Design a protein around this ligand. Sequence first.
Ligand SMILES: [Hg+2]
Ligand SMILES: [Hg+2]
Lengths: 125, 124
Amino acid sequence: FRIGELADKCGVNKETIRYYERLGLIPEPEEKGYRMQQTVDRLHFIKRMQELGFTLNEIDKLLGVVDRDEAKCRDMYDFTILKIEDIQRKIEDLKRIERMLMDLKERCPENKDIYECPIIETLMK
Amino acid sequence: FRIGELADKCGVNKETIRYYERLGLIPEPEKGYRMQQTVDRLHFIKRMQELGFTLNEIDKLLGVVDRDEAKCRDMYDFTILKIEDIQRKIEDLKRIERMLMDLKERCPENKDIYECPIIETLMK
Ligand SMILES: [Hg+2]
Ligand SMILES: [Hg+2]
């Protein structure tokens, strides 16, 4: 149904890497070529998974599994849980950085109009 | 004094972009290629990036701190800004996490099936 300049209606710029990577299907040759609906859907799915924090690699694996299995709902459920747990790990890492920044900033004296900043000194060593 | 890929003892591969972008200094010797206060500054830049400052942020920051009398005050302020930036990111991540929790709540008790409500929801 669509031509790829169209179908970039999924909010993706004209993307050969996706089918180059097997994620997206190959288009079919119409009046010669060249057109891509279930691909529209697969591309929505992929775009949103990426907005949900799945890497392209993860999406590659996931799609292989769901495509080849009988219980697709179960697969997808499982991967979504693994994703929740991944996001939680990222969150914790950011919290660890926040805490570091906090300790750094708490190093500063009452009078901060000085050349010597314990933050800079600390990060310099 | 130090040299070259020895300055890559800061854990950064040989980096022209920094000096091109004016972040780092650089000298002529016998004719090295020398570069010590640069060692400190490059440590500083590296660790700021490990703490979530972007290159652009570091660019600005270094401009301000290099030109000001109260450097500590500046660095303190910028650090507060960074903490708050990190906090926004954390909250964005919590929104995504909850989105995923809701998605997974859509799936039926018996999941051995072709139809997945998660996939269907993300498709529309
Ligand atoms: Hg499901
Ligand atoms: Hg300070």
